[PDB]
Amino acid sequence: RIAGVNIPDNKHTVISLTYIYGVGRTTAQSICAATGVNPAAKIKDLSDEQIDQLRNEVAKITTEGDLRREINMNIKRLMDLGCYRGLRHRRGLPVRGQRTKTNARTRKGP
């Protein structure tokens, strides 16, 4: 609603845009360089005039509500095909090829 999702205040522009869930740290710097908003100033100090430009920039990369949909569809493409990469993904084993004998604990919990 503020930019697609609620944004924190009393913080710099680049850090504030990092919470948009689809723009990280480097792409946030590129958005600020293109628009002209100075990261040194807080989002509170900014005017309500260029935030439309910030929203336009957000509307050209992705929004979280569709990014999660499309990344889930990308996962589904592997999960419905028979590939080993999805075969381990459903069971919850490491996917990229990490060792499963020990310490594959992030994908299996305590």
Partner: protein
């Protein structure tokens, strides 16, 4: 309508980023602009598009030519 029960319900102006001024009677008692309205939302503007489904065929031809 009971007198001393309801809040103050006055008239204010809702101005979107595109400039669509809407006269709305609310409890706001002040005008506040909005970032997006019914005329600017992508779904009602027709700009929502689709999730693009899947394009591996396309991708492979874009990636690898494979003459013959």
């Amino acid at each position: 309508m009971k007198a001393d029960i309801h809040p103050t319900y006055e008239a204010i102006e809702a101005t979107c980023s595109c400039g669509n001024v809407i006269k709305t009677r609310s409890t706001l008692c002040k005008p506040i602009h909005l970032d997006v309205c019914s005329e600017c939302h992508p779904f009602y503007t027709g700009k929502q598009k689709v999730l693009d489904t899947g394009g591996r065929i396309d991708r492979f031809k874009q990636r690898f030519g494979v003459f013959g």
